[PDB]
């Protein structure tokens, strides 16, 4: 027995005992009974037993015109671990006028070697090549089940419906699920525009740019190009009532329709955008924050069981660095903002404040995630078999989020000054402790690539 | 070690591994690793290891107009161990003029050493006196933590929005669940006297006589109320897209709105009523059966994670001694079908159609219910803890529902004739085999009652 | 030719003219032409000839808890002249232990030979005993065509969904249109009691006591009731977007479902029940005042034709002699406000601000309201054959509502202080000048009862 | 007094009323009285004068893959005389390349001196040039203020939205209206090849590559661009449930949207285009025949008065010289159907149904679009001071309509075989009778262009 965790509560989305676990070899092999010796002995007295967070929305390391994102394969890893996570599935992205095989490539040359924790890949299709498109055919066989395309971001990102009915297409065929981020870009244009026209370039024009509206219809045109093909389709960050409206009525229809949510929609609002001195570009991310009223919603949907998952779309634009460039054009701030480490913490609070049960916590946190992306169930829960994916959580510590505390690259906190309860103490990677009471104590050659599951939904 | 169940690939809503697991003392102490030595061994080889199943629904012993049901207490926890479900809640019925504590004395004469499973009550409120609604401040110490109320059924079991508000604000006061049958019994009775007085008294007017409308209307005006008293409510059988489509609008307004279908809603339409030689008086239950959309509807609801579990709604009214007193009005037809021995296996056939996963089965038949009605986690899962409540099922096994199979005191099955795939094996209560290789093998004394914790939602 | 008005616009909901009227006993006898010489002449020059206004929805004469309304059928008729209405259809309301002629016969007295314009009588059935429900068969052909019962207002209006489903299934027999006030009535006092018990006492709880949620519930049964009985029904005073919306799901279910509004529901808020030293006490009416929001649903819902009418449900208390038994307590206070003189202007109001256009504003005020309640095209319009039902229209006329400047018999108005700009200048009934240049001018014996067609729709 | 009109019941939207009429000089001077002597006297003993039908939807004349359509301006309008219309709107079409005016010009050519009655022209903008664009600051100021678009036709009509935020935007500025053909046409291209491929051809093809969702979802966007630049929209053709829900959807959210359905949406279905021998191909229209549910949908939708008027959306492919390039293949078959002759009588049978009333015949068959379009109160209705443009209806005439009876260039008829109740007996287009008994009678030198006026909603 390589190592064993006792006197804790261990907490799966479908149960909770006071029992003591057995490592070997990076699985749990032993829950309960006789137990033996062991290398290492934990005490997880007081403490809870959770499954490793599972992030399946992350951006660890980019390059947005020219310029690169303040954290890497490595800085974001790290910070994921502190924070709980053990999984990450982040979104490798194709170069236009390049192969799909070439961006894998590169990914596994960021990757490899240098992640703290497990990972996993999302492939973005941005130019939909004849040959491109075929190669869907292939990158699933590889691991990679999951194929991501955008409505917005124009000369940029975005695909057009025939490009999404091709994915979409491709994606029956080999068993995959779509993913996509729903905003008509064109929509959006029209008024970032107007209003720079008007000489109105603050942050807040960020969201008033692109309203509810923006989301919800491309939500809507998603969800019926799905229906029209018949396949599955997630929709990544759904943000508001008037979106989660459409995926609501797509299910009911029988669409295979999945969602998600990210943490700061449940916490942020697009008054933070007005914060004083420029401080307000720390929140430009997409979708744009919406109001307290879409929190509720989104915290009601959670615990109805509508989302698959409270993911964080990681971004890393220093606020000093990156975000400058946008001091006089909030079109030119580069979009999103930085929470795979605060992730757990934060989606726990709600558990704190009967938002969300215990139990739901451990599944939309990790175990529902690793279902819908096929990683279930040698990822995602606390069972014999399971890899040692392990965080011990204390409900009673208390503490207060500032970025000086954090353990990635970045200048700022989204969730600076908020007080919580509960915090991630030590974490296990498939048996291996890489964060021991608040000190990463891994190496950058601990994390491994993920070949993920077909047929996701 | 009292017993070990080995090779066999353990089940859980939130798990699948291959382990071994030990029981001793009527509950699981250790899964996976060196299990010893013990009394007995079970080779659940080529087998699933499921929680036990969990049927909040039943109507296990009952007393309609005189005459009784044709199943006991006995009778029917005996068919439901063979069915695979281990705990059930039976609706406690109050009688006119008498209190609920004489109810509930009335209910353990019943239960009391008779039971092959373990059991909860529901307590059933259809005579609302002030002394009666101050009840509702005792039995949860004792218990009892859900109260039912039916909007249908006059002059029997309806009550008002008056009661019905009364005991939503009990409920609230005292961490309960209001649970309610929603039908505008007046529509109905102004439909059923109609369609009699005209000379329609087939059983197909059951139905006719309570189109989705009528079920609807109750469903909406019932979870407004529960807004209004700012109270969690529970629609039990949800069996149609319109009264699905209430609830549905109630979460999103934020209403602690919960519901459930039944076995029969996914598998019997309203056509069933018409089958010839008074046959269609064996489907004469409400809500009617309904259409085939509708189990799409519902099916597609089960897998986004709307209802809180599949419940049967178990009834045991003699297609020749009861069911016969309305060969001349379906009126006189005492409603209500059998199904708590079917319910499993039933449901099941749904993870072999894609309809729903093989995990999200063990979440609707045992682990969710659980969890509303406060038995979680002592029941409800498969962890070091829990209740030794275990189900070995055999997903390979093939078999024709025949009720000259089935064991409790009826005379047809609402399933007669369906071809199933996946079959109880043995059955194990709190650690005693009580079904073995399909042959029951327990004592009406083994089951007991369980004292259910309060705040559902 | 008795009458000749000249120099005028002549608009109908269809139909913008300029040209001249030739009026020849009581009634339109020639449009445009030559018409000839004229007992008298009257110059319409720079003024519109518009129909004269149909309220259906009037509470004249009324008797609440012993104590008598400030208003009679004399002095209110004359005040609705006054305001542009020729036209009124007043809410006869059966006594309990009465039949239905007895109280025509009480109606017919306070209006015969009283009334200054003509009037029709709707029949309020709060006390369904066999042979008053067996009246409904003969009121029909007296001329009373449109039966109203109340889902509210315990022990004195209420009555259930039995004698709902009775009065549709009687109006349907007899080609009547049942109209009703939804709220539900239970609710209502569950928070009205739970206020007071609080201490709360205010006006402002008369509003929260009874939330949107309460009228769109009782809605939503009400069309569903018309739907299962298969009548159509019309529901007054829509006042917020949740119940609104039921009417609108109804009607796309096929339901022959109508709606009104009320001038007061596009002009005051719930916060008006917050005016300080008891003013609020004016504002209690039923439903209570919306929000502003509801204001923009309701207009929208007006220029897209959903509603049949915009009617007052004018009622007379005093606020120092009536509304005074309240100050302690909100309960107390006497529901209504006064409004049958403002109506026109208000609406019209509505066309001065784009919310609704020039032609609308005759189909609301007085078009669309004589074809459901049968009195088309003798009412409603300016055609040949028409009644001489005119109003001579100053839209550039500005003035400031007061109560002083008013011709009823109430302490204030529920729109002093608004600015008007558009105001009724001479009415005409039958041929007849009743107002003239803003004096009344007419005898308490023009008036004449109106016996309404059958078939409402 | 040129002529004069007598005996008749005049019906118009919001009147009925027996008198005579008086015209002179093209226009209606006189309604009842003494009217004197006129060259011509009609006995309209017996029958309804009805408002001109005006048809805010043909394609009078079209060149498609360079064919021509049958009927021409001249054949085109004869039968829309014959068939009670005297006012029509056709949609002129630019053409790639080219300028607005240029197209306006060609319209000229096509309609001046040619046309038996009144016309105005939409403009339809397929080239959305920066100068193109720019015209639209133009053309209104020329009578055509209402531009239409195309969402689906790769390559032939389709623009986008960037395209018809463009649009929307000059409308706004320059008070027109846009109107939109909401089909998503990536969605409907990538069906009709996947069918194409697995080699469907038949016509039935033509209906299911384009399904309810493609016309919804293209619907929905439109109105949701719409909302974005907080313009006035029109939904031309709105066949089903679904996209007839977004509307509604949309004028909740306070969208100034508008839509209207056409003749065949009330009588044909997708089972049409499965006649055998190829005659399915007669009903390959756009969007596709639906399900007569719809049928019920559409026709509560107009008795709601949901919708702005019931246009033809004429179009003239002969089934054998045109619709026969498409025997093998359904997409090669030209998209379209006749009936600008149908329309009223069919409109009108709607009436005999109790569908919808016979005053809102008149409403939605020329009333209201008169409204719309900016050509009210010249034309639509019946009133001194409009062109006199009249339709005298026989209500008990009966017959069935047979192509070899109509009056247009066409080989078939949409309603050929249909027996209807209500024909057209003599029209007058402002003033001159152009239709006797029956019989054309009047001259192709007859009809003038109307400059329509601006701020349509
Ligand atoms: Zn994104
Ligand atoms: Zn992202
Ligand atoms: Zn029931
Ligand atoms: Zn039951
Ligand atoms: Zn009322
Ligand atoms: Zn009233
Ligand atoms: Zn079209
Ligand atoms: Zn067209």
């Given at each position: ?18 029992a003591d676990?057995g ?7 032993q829950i309960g009974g006789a137990l033996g ?421």
């Amino acid at each position: 027995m390589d190592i064993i965790i006792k006197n804790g509560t261990i907490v799966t989305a479908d149960g909770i005992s006071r029992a003591d676990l057995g490592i070997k070899d990076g699985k749990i092999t032993q829950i309960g009974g006789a137990l033996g010796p062991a290398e290492r002995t934990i005490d997880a007295a007081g403490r809870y037993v959770f499954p490793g967070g599972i992030d399946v929305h992350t951006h660890v390391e980019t390059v947005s015109f020219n310029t690169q994102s303040a954290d890497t394969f490595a800085t974001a890893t790290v910070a994921a671990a502190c924070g709980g996570t053990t999984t990450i599935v982040d979104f490798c992205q194709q170069d236009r006028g390049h192969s799909l095989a070439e961006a894998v490539a590169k990914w596994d040359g960021m990757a490899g070697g240098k992640s703290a924790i497990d990972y996993g890949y999302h492939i973005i299709v941005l130019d939909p090549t004849d040959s491109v498109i075929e190669e869907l055919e292939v990158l699933p066989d590889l691991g990679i089940t999951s194929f991501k395309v955008f409505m917005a971001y124009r000369g940029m990102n975005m695909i057009d419906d025939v490009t999404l009915l091709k994915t979409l297409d491709k994606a029956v065929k080999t068993g995959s699920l779509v993913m996509v981020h729903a905003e008509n870009g064109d929509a959006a244009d029209y008024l970032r525009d107007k209003f720079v026209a008007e000489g109105k370039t603050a942050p807040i024009y960020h969201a008033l740019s692109r309203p509810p509206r923006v989301e919800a219809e491309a939500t809507a045109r998603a969800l019926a190009l799905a229906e029209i093909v018949n396949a599955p389709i997630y929709i990544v960050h759904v943000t508001c009532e008037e979106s989660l409206e459409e995926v609501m009525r797509a299910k009911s229809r029988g669409v295979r329709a999945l969602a998600e949510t990210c943490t700061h929609y449940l916490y942020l609002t697009k008054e933070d955008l007005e914060r004083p001195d420029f401080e307000g570009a720390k929140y430009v991310f997409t979708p744009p924050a919406r109001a307290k009223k879409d929190h509720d919603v989104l915290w009601n949907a959670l615990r109805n069981g509508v989302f698959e998952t409270v993911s964080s779309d990681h971004c890393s634009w220093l606020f000093k660095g990156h975000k400058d460039r946008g001091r006089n054009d909030f079109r030119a701030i580069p979009n999103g903002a930085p929470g795979v480490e605060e992730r757990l913490m934060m989606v726990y609070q709600g558990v704190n404040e009967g938002r969300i049960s215990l139990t739901q916590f451990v599944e939309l946190v990790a175990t529902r995630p690793a279902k819908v992306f096929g990683m279930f169930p040698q990822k995602g829960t606390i069972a014999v078999g399971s890899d040692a994916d392990i965080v011990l959580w204390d409900p009673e510590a208390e503490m207060v989020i500032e970025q000086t505390a954090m353990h990635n690259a970045m200048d700022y906190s989204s969730y600076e000054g908020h007080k919580v309860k509960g915090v991630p103490k030590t974490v296990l990677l498939r048996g291996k402790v890489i964060v021991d009471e608040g000190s990463y104590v891994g190496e950058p050659t601990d994390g491994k690539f993920l070949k993920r599951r077909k047929y996701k939904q």
